[PDB]
């Protein structure tokens, strides 16, 4: 699991892989680790998969309740305040590593949330198991006020570094671009790995399996 984000001169670019492991066996080849919160704020999750899913739906339910009451657009500091207050109350038993990003009236904002309640406002963050590989790409090749296509080159480079170096990562690369008006979500962006072709015909025809008792039930 490797998630990362950066703030360029106009918006925020997020990225992740789509591998969800189980023990040391690949359980899901195409997962989804970028979540909806509001039409301007998304969130990337890491750690316990069910703890990140059930938390990110409750806050997105509350902000829909909040913004529909106010009749306005939500703010990223509102979602930061809910998460650092909820996770601190459960004393870190809910293991959820989060990256929070969105564009407000005040502009773009990026956060990193640790499963105890400590939060950080940074221009770029990495979380996950292969987060150390992507951070070395960031520090080597960061400059402030990049463009959009320069930033999309940087994140897809950093996520691919965690693919080819970490065992828990490695799949197709997700991206998302959140700007002042444009919202782009790319469920495939780059396919680095394929599956080889099957060489041998393995099919025996119908009737090669012994059956004890059959049963037919029609429907409507």
């Amino acid at each position: 699991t490797t998630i990362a984000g950066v703030v360029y001169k106009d918006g925020i670019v997020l990225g992740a892989d789509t591998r969800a492991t189980e023990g040391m066996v690949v359980a899901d080849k195409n997962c989804s680790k970028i979540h909806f919160i509001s039409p301007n704020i998304y969130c990337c999750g890491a750690g316990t998969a069910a703890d990140t899913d059930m938390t990110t739906q409750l806050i997105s339910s509350n902000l829909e309740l909040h913004s529909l009451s106010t009749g306005r657009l939500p703010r990223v500091v509102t979602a930061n305040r809910m998460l650092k207050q909820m996770l601190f109350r459960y004393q870190g038993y809910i293991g959820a590593a989060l990256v929070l990003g969105g564009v407000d009236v005040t502009g773009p904002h990026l956060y990193s949330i640790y499963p105890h309640g400590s939060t950080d406002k940074l221009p770029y963050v990495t979380m996950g198991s292969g987060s150390l590989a992507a951070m070395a790409v960031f520090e080597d090749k960061f400059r402030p006020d990049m463009e959009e296509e320069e930033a999309k080159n940087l994140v897809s480079e950093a996520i691919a570094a965690g693919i080819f170096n970490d065992l828990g990562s490695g799949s197709n690369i997700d991206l998302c671009v959140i700007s002042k008006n444009k919202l782009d979500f790319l469920r495939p962006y780059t396919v680095p790995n394929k599956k080889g072709t099957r060489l041998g015909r393995y099919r025996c025809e119908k009737g090669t399996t012994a059956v004890l008792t059959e049963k037919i039930t029609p429907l409507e």
Binding site: L132, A133, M135, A136, V137, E139, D140, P144, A161, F164
Partner: protein, 215 residues
């Protein structure tokens, strides 16, 4: 050794065209304390091979004592032979495996760079007797941080010149100064060629802190 008292940190190494370059810093730490700010962690074996190490430093002075004697022992024969860098890598592997088999290991992690017969050698030695060869090596947190930078360039371009490899190490040593909690801004670079072994002085990096104004 059951408890490492004074420890080193990450050691880097990468091949290039006609030689191997190895860099490490000059800090010995006792826990969180940076106690010894000025030590050397690279031993220059005789003419074509070269050693750097991590882990416990008192064990490193022991192997510095033993390997220093064995090189003198063959030179006094004078028959026109020497130890290849692979033979020292083979010798040091059996030293680690026999030591851990008595449940009393040597807390180290050693990198051997050599250049003999027009062949660049770069060998790894673990405490647990794990050993292999690689075009680029990294110990400690450098295996988590600098090792993605090494493999990215080498899989794009397999061969490197000397100036390309020397500049690329200085970039990785810069990154290790940021993200490693137990690093230090004073390092030395050692390089084997066909001309011999040369060790550079206490070099330093140049940091960037322009993101501190961004709240």
């Amino acid at each position: 050794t059951q408890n490492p008292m004074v420890t080193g940190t990450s050691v880097l190494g990468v091949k290039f065209e006609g030689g191997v370059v190895i860099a490490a810093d000059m800090l010995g730490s006792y826990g969180s304390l940076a106690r010894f700010r000025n030590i050397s962690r690279i031993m220059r074996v005789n003419n074509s091979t070269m050693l750097g190490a991590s882990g416990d430093y008192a064990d490193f002075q022991y192997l510095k004592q033993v390997l220093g004697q064995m090189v003198i022992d063959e030179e006094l024969l004078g028959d026109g032979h020497s130890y290849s860098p692979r033979a020292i890598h083979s010798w040091l592997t059996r030293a680690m495996y026999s030591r851990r088999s008595k449940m009393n290991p040597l807390w180290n992690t050693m990198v051997i760079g050599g250049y003999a017969d027009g062949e660049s050698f770069l060998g790894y030695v673990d405490m647990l007797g794990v050993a292999y060869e690689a075009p680029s090596l990294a110990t400690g947190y450098g295996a988590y941080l600098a090792q993605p930078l090494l493999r990215e360039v080498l899989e794009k371009q397999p061969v490197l010149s000397q100036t390309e490899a020397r500049d690329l190490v200085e970039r990785c040593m810069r990154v290790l100064y940021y993200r490693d909690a137990r690093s230090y801004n004073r390092f030395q670079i050692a390089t084997v060629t066909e001309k011999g072994v040369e060790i550079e002085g206490p070099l330093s990096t140049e940091t960037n802190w322009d993101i501190a104004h961004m709240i």
